[PDB]
Amino acid sequence: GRVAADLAAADLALGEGEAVVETVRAAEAEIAGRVRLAYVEAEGDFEVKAVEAVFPDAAAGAAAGSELSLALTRAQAQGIVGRWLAEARVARDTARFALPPSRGHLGTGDVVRLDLPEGKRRYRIDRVEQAGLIQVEAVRVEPGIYAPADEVED
Amino acid sequence: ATILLSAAGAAIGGGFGGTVLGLGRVIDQRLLGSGSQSVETGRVDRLRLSSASEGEAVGRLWGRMRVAGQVIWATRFFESASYSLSLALALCEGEILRVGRVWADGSEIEVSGLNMRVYRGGEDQLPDPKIAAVEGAEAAPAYRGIAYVVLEDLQLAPFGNRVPQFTFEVVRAAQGALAEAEPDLTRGLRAVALIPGTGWSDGENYARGHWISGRAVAQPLASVVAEICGAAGITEIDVSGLYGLVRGYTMTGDQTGRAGLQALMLAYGFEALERDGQLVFRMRDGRVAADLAAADLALGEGEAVVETVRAAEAEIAGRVRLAYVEAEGDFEVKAVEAVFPDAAAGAAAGSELSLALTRAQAQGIVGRWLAEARVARDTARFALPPSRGHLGTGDVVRLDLPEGKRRYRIDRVEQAGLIQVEAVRVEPGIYAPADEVED
Amino acid sequence: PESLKAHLQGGVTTLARAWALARADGRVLGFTDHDVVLRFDGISFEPGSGMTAKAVLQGTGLSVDNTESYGALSSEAITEADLLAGRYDGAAVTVWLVNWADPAMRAVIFRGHLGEVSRGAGAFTAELRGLTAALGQEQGRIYHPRCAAVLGDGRCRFDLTKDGYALEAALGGVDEAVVLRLAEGAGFEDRWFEKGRLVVLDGAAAGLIGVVKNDRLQADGSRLIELWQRLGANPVAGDRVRIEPGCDKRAGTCRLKFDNFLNFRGFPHIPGEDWMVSYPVQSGTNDGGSLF
Amino acid sequence: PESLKAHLQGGVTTLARAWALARADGRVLGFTDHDVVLRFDGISFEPGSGMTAKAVLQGTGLSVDNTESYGALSSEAITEADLLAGRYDGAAVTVWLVNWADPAMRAVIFRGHLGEVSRGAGAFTAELRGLTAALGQEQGRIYHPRCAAVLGDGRCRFDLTKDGYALEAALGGVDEAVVLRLAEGAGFEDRWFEKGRLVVLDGAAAGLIGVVKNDRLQADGSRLIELWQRLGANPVAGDRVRIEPGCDKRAGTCRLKFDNFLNFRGFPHIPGEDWMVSYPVQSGTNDGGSLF
Amino acid sequence: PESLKAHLQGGVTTLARAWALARADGRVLGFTDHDVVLRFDGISFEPGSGMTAKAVLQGTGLSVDNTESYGALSSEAITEADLLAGRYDGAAVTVWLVNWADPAMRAVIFRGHLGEVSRGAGAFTAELRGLTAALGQEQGRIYHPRCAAVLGDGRCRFDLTKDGYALEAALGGVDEAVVLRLAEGAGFEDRWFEKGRLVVLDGAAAGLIGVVKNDRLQADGSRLIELWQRLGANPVAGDRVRIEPGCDKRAGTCRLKFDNFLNFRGFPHIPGEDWMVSYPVQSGTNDGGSLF
Amino acid sequence: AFHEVRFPANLSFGSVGGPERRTEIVTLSSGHEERNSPWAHSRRHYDAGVGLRSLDDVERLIAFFEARGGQLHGFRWKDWAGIVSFNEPPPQGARVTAGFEFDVPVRFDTDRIAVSVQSFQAGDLPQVPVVEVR
Amino acid sequence: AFHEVRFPANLSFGSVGGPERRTEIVTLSSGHEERNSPWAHSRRHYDAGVGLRSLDDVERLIAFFEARGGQLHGFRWKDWAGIVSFNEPPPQGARVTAGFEFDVPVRFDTDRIAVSVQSFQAGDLPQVPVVEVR
Amino acid sequence: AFHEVRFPANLSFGSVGGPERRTEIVTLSSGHEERNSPWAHSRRHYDAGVGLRSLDDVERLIAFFEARGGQLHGFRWKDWAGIVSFNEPPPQGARVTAGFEFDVPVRFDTDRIAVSVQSFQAGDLPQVPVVEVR
Amino acid sequence: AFHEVRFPANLSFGSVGGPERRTEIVTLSSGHEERNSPWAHSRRHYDAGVGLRSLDDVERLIAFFEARGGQLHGFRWKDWAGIVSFNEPPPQGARVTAGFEFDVPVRFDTDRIAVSVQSFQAGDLPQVPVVEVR
Numbered sequence A: 001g002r003v004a005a006d007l008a009a010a011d012l013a014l015g016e017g018e019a020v021v022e023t024v025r026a027a028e029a030e031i032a033g034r035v036r037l038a039y040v041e042a043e044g045d046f047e048v049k050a051v052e053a054v055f056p057d058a059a060a061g062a063a064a065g066s067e068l069s070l071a072l073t074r075a076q077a078q079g080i081v082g083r084w085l086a087e088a089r090v091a092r093d094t095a096r097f098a099l100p101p102s103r104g105h106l107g108t109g110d111v112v113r114l115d116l117p118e119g120k121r122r123y124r125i126d127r128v129e130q131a132g133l134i135q136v137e138a139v140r141v142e143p144g145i146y147a148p149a150d151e152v153e154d
Numbered sequence B: 001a002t003i004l005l006s007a008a009g010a011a012i013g014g015g016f017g018g019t020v021l022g023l024g025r026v027i028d029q030r031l032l033g034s035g036s037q038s039v040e041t042g043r044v045d046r047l048r049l050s051s052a053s054e055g056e057a058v059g060r061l062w063g064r065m066r067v068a069g070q071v072i073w074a075t076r077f078f079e080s081a082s083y084s085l086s087l088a089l090a091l092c093e094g095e096i097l098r099v100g101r102v103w104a105d106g107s108e109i110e111v112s113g114l115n116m117r118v119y120r121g122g123e124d125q126l127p128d129p130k131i132a133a134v135e136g137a138e139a140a141p142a143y144r145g146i147a148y149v150v151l152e153d154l155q156l157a158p159f160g161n162r163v164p165q166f167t168f169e170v171v172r173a174a175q176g177a178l179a180e181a182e183p184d185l186t187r188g189l190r191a192v193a194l195i196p197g198t199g200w201s202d203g204e205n206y207a208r209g210h211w212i213s214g215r216a217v218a219q220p221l222a223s224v225v226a227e228i229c230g231a232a233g234i235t236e237i238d239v240s241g242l243y244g245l246v247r248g249y250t251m252t253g254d255q256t257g258r259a260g261l262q263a264l265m266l267a268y269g270f271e272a273l274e275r276d277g278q279l280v281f282r283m284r285d286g287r288v289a290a291d292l293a294a295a296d297l298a299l300g301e302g303e304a305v306v307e308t309v310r311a312a313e314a315e316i317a318g319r320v321r322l323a324y325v326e327a328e329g330d331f332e333v334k335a336v337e338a339v340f341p342d343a344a345a346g347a348a349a350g351s352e353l354s355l356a357l358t359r360a361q362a363q364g365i366v367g368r369w370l371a372e373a374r375v376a377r378d379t380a381r382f383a384l385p386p387s388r389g390h391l392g393t394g395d396v397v398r399l400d401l402p403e404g405k406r407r408y409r410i411d412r413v414e415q416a417g418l419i420q421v422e423a424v425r426v427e428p429g430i431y432a433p434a435d436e437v438e439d
Numbered sequence C, D, E: 001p002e003s004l005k006a007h008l009q010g011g012v013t014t015l016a017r018a019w020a021l022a023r024a025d026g027r028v029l030g031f032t033d034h035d036v037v038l039r040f041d042g043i044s045f046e047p048g049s050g051m052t053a054k055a056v057l058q059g060t061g062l063s064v065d066n067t068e069s070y071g072a073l074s075s076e077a078i079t080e081a082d083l084l085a086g087r088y089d090g091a092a093v094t095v096w097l098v099n100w101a102d103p104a105m106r107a108v109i110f111r112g113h114l115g116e117v118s119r120g121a122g123a124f125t126a127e128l129r130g131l132t133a134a135l136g137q138e139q140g141r142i143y144h145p146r147c148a149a150v151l152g153d154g155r156c157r158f159d160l161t162k163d164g165y166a167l168e169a170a171l172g173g174v175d176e177a178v179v180l181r182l183a184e185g186a187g188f189e190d191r192w193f194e195k196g197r198l199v200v201l202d203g204a205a206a207g208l209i210g211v212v213k214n215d216r217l218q219a220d221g222s223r224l225i226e227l228w229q230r231l232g233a234n235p236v237a238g239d240r241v242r243i244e245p246g247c248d249k250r251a252g253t254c255r256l257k258f259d260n261f262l263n264f265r266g267f268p269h270i271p272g273e274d275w276m277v278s279y280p281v282q283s284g285t286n287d288g289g290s291l292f
Numbered sequence F, G, H, I: 001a002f003h004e005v006r007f008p009a010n011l012s013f014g015s016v017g018g019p020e021r022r023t024e025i026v027t028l029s030s031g032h033e034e035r036n037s038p039w040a041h042s043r044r045h046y047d048a049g050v051g052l053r054s055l056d057d058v059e060r061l062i063a064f065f066e067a068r069g070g071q072l073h074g075f076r077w078k079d080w081a082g083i084v085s086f087n088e089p090p091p092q093g094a095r096v097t098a099g100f101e102f103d104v105p106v107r108f109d110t111d112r113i114a115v116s117v118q119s120f121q122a123g124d125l126p127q128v129p130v131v132e133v134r
């Protein structure tokens, strides 16, 4: 989450859609309420296992799981799925703004502070298409997502 | 600077990724019509096997149908000296009725030979089985929702010495808040008795006989589709117009919710209408609600009162097929087909339904699809005014023309103050019993 | 339409669109095309916001209906500091089609669920997903060796207030809305609640749920607690939070910390694939035991 | 083009498009761009209808060619009461590119099959699927326990006129073109033909095929018969139908009602999956028998 | 940008785009928007060609970046007889964004790989695939019974000049650039090199690689050799080619013709599926042998 | 739909309007083509009315659009050009008159009107297109 | 299709119209061209008729569009410009006349007409295009 | 929203403006129509104001757009054309007046204005459209 | 392609036309750009001919379009502006003449023509664009 940009709202360029910051919030019906893995046991007899992380308020649906073929331990797998369930609900918000080539040193993977009148929410950026007007599809990223979960082991 | 030919790239992603967000299949799409996109549904499980991994999902079923189960808490092999185990096979969730007729890998084993302790999987939270006092009480699992079946001192001698794949006939009553109101047999009976007795025999009148052996299990179609929306969380579900018997449907876990329901929309054909926020599930009939003349349509977008599309002859599904489950005998995958006599030259279009139904019924269903899919070739694309907006999205229009007076059931109503309709041709006589003989 | 057909079959008609959305919080909001504030239920529909009403679609198929519903955000209205923080997510709407001359002549076009809201340029655009949004999602349990339910769930009932389990104390030291100092840290174990509900019931974030992590008390019962995610509304160092205890969703942490090991709803033993294709060798341990 | 290159290499050319479609019935229809009625074969191409001729496409791949062929429907023409009832389905076309000055200077662009016809606004638009329409379809038998063939088929030849099997009688009481009274019901068993061909050879529906169901005679040999689907053209209570007998496509109904049990083309026994993975237990019945 | 931010934060800026592509041959080409020829490295960027610079895109995902880079082809430039013959295929570019007032104020937007070049109407349009083009391709060996490597490869080092193996002789009789007569045919076996590298190092096709087939000497050591494909540039019956010997990539042809059977990198025996599910019958040959 | 009044009397020289026919048409690229119409009548489709009087006439004219107008009401229209037939062909017109004596109930083809002031008392508005909805 | 009458006699100066062809064309980009004609005939395509008389002539003209018109009937058209040939080239016209003596049966190219009032008795309409359907 | 002043007094001959409606409409293609009105009111929608005075009047007019304008304020508008009703039909207008005596609070329909110099002291600007936001 | 006649003699003042060059062009956004043409000739591309005589000249002019015209025939064209070279540069024109003496065979750039009647005897048609196809 190490912020490189610090844009104010006054410092965005004039976009294509003639909105300084188009902000999309994704659907509640698709937020991945519970996430799953298919890691490999990596300590014992190497076997396919699964852990899941369940968000306490909305556990009513949206199971979204994936399968990773690598091998990792038991507290680490619950750490990863604990990280995705936090991130996939953080990454609901996406921003679609344009910033001028006066500051073109915002590389395609940097993260923008983006001061607003209401919020001051960070945004990591994707899909930079410039042609002399850097237009950005950002996505909401918080710093505290990328931490150890500090869980006990098996 | 100018833009490249990723103008085609930004036209797709996410130029078309926004669509399916807010939205064999060879015969699945025609039966739902223009309708909506038919989700992949019910690749029927043949050779039901039990995998003891950790990534298989919890199955669900409604009625008399075999399910594989999977191993949870097997003890070590015990040599008497020629082996013995203590399995526990977890079948499905929810409170069930009893499990009878266990057959392992191969033909059949007698349940009297076993020491199995079945469990309903009650939300009442059944205690420990005490065969898990191998583990001890302090780590004994006490499964609440799932309905596990333990096996005690199972001799692995007759089937090799390996563990055999066990498969279990399970009877599960349809549950959910709409099911506990309006009780059908499975608790509605409240004591039937009257066992005929009076003792190879006279079973030729069993399909017409008053006694209710066997078919007392089968849940009404009203509560099973209510169980789906209940598990999905839609309690606003309206299902009084449904009239069908399920007899052992089975969808697995992570079967999308709707894709389990969509197999029923092919069998019993019902609307899933949603006039209002009730999401009315009515059985599809030809009962005409509109009676439009040709003079009473609105001015459409394409400036044609009625655009009428007739589909290609090369794709009419000349012969249709199923993959139902036997539902009377040993539950096995079977197939019937209906062949139209004039054009049998091609267009085989089959699909697979994972439910269980009898022999004359399967030839009845495929006889219904082959008639309907050739009826539903004609689609109409007209616009009707908001002066009569009470044409709900699933109603059927008489649509008087100068030449024909052909009915049309409607789909894809997009109004904005001008109800524009993609209808489809539907006749009333399609939805009848075929009246065929049995096996 | 429900018995306004007498009004509607005449070409002289006057049906002005209007709708109410009920937020996850108990308050509703009113919206109308009629340009005059009107009401029929106790909702007080305001034409100050909302209401472009673009093209509700339908389908006999399980696919949802949709309406983008362009409008305006303002201080009386949604105001977008409310929206960004995490409200209006599962907001339930009913669209109505009322007669403004007589609001007793109305019906519901659909009852929606308002999935995707895109706000920008001083306005908002909110896709109204249809009644069938919940269908089309995966629901199931996968026999994993943890638990599967939340604390309040029916599959594991707990009586979460039954003793000194919940930490009811009012908040101080909110910092960057992830760290929370909490004046009354003392009263519980260190690292007692690690997966709990930080329901904040006062002030700015009213009834907003976050999840705790790193329950550590540094000195004299401070109890500095992190969260996974921002609350989205800053608490004001005077709010009252309550934190339910943390469940690791494991058999050892189940029975030790909590009494409710009976209502487990989990799958602890679950032997494995290599057990299944194994044939029994007649060597070494082949007596009845735990297999653990 | 076939040896009109001498005509065509000159810039002064006059090739006017024209095509004939042959319906499933024996009659053909003529269409031309030339604006004057012309013919080279006995087809009499009429410029009164058809003929916009938009952009025939090609491909070395098995995918079909296409031409939407916008035109007009009229009483001399297709007339759309003919089209809606079920004709023009497998209609075969040839598009030509004739010289109107000399119609012996012509070729075929493609020979098509006219798949999708969309009529509307007093006109019709008919997609001309290419020569390779039949490829791209599934053809096969799936070892199912019924039969697999129709009565006239080569895999089960029957001689369908060999006795009093067919019911040749003229029709009365057509009602809603699904129920048919039939004055001469008497002559056959009750429920004799349940899957047969209701070929109607006179009147409005000339040579039109439907399928029977519910062969029931109510009183004095009425023989009220339903159909699966509408004929699409109303019979006029004087037409002549013939109904071939009904085959249930089952071994019992094969050999009893019909003599042709030899030409079965079906798979009656077909043991099952559970037989296949079964190992032979040495208990109970293990002697040679039917397994039925 | 790299420390031109002092230049760039001012609204008065003058950054003119410019790029260099390095061909597979050692020469580079220069291109700029500045309309005056400028250089900073020894590249001499020419504004005579290239340079429309349309919309470089980006992505954190592994998907490539793209820029279509419309321009002009001319005799100084790409000239398209160079391009069609097989050059500029894996041409590597760097796009720069130089200050024309001071070319020491520059950076790289991306370093590309120029995948798809579409030339037409006297111009060329060349899609600049991004840095991650190689990802997204399948690389692997499939245990097939041949070899898997080329002659120069690290997995089979050969020292391809170690004896009289290579045929260094200058070319005559180029005909249609597939047949090559070759004056000095004599010196080797008949059909010695059947899969070799026809590197042509002089004249028109300079450093261009084709593959041989049909190494046949007809009379007095002619050695008429075909190729699979055209060279794309006509050799002028005076060029010098060298042809490395042909490897059939088989164990017999490996060890006999070449000494390097040790460095095989192939899988000769590879028993089969039917061996795997076979259970050992106790009949016939069941002693240890080749299984071949 | 009303029966309220004809109109203000004044109409400027140029009040255009004539019958409008659906005339769905196929336009075969060969040559001659067929056509049909589903009306069996003709929307008279009068346009280009102009009010020109004093400003005393304007306030009874701007609310003519507003009060009994709105959008969706009759205001029977006077034509300067009970069943009337047209016998100048051997065919016939035979077009009905729901209102008496050429009064043709209509509606204005405008979301807004635009009245101008051209002098201390001059009130003008350039067009009020109608279509005579039944 | 009718044989009813020519037209009202009056036609203003400017009644334009001349024959058509489709004659689609490829324009081979590196040399000359080659072009095809599918007609062997020509649509005469008369336009820009204007009725100008008293208002007594107007009511027999507005229902000329309506009564025998509708959309789909003949009303044989008089040209101010049985087979006629054109012999001023060594080629030939040889264009047929289904009707007698330059009478060219047509149809109006309009969904609506637009008659104007120019003074107390002046009736004008600016255009009535035709194409002479067979 | 303000209550600041009417306007500069000068308005040229041609200051056009009249009420609006949305009144969306379906035009049932085989007969008459049916049409809905969601307003019960009308946007008065005045356009085409022109300031014409000396350059002394211009600097109090260009900052009229700027100072109390910005974009989003009232500046009550004077009509040369508390509830007013219109009784010339048997229907009624009954349209409210939030401001007193025809003062119709508005806003300018412009992102920019365009004042011109016509002579040493002539100041002109061709149009300032308004719509009377509530 | 014919050799039939030049044309009617009359051509009005304004008969425009000059050579048309493919001139495929790249327009590099840097600056200077290259170009090439594949003709080595120039389509002369004459436009805006006007016939103006009596109506006796019109019937030999309307069938000039029709009889020897159709669309796809020569009718050698007279220029009011065997190999001709242009020597006023040190370069050369060297453009061929397939027909003799500036006669430039063409074709009309029209699907239809449009002849007007302007008085009892006046025949006019506004344009006949050609392009001199080889």
Ligand code: SF4
Binding pocket: C147, C148, C149, C150, C151, C156, C158, C247, C248, C249, C250, C253, C254, C258, C260, C261, C263, C264, C265
């Ligand atoms: S540990 Fe106990 S209380 Fe916690 S989630 Fe698991 S079963 Fe529920």
Ligand code: SF4
Binding pocket: D147, D148, D149, D150, D151, D156, D158, D247, D248, D249, D250, D253, D254, D258, D260, D261, D263, D264, D265
């Ligand atoms: S029953 Fe006999 S005649 Fe009938 S379809 Fe089967 S094989 Fe053919």
Ligand code: SF4
Binding pocket: E147, E148, E149, E150, E151, E156, E158, E247, E248, E249, E250, E253, E254, E258, E260, E261, E263, E264, E265
């Ligand atoms: S035969 Fe030998 S030298 Fe040739 S490719 Fe195989 S390993 Fe390499």
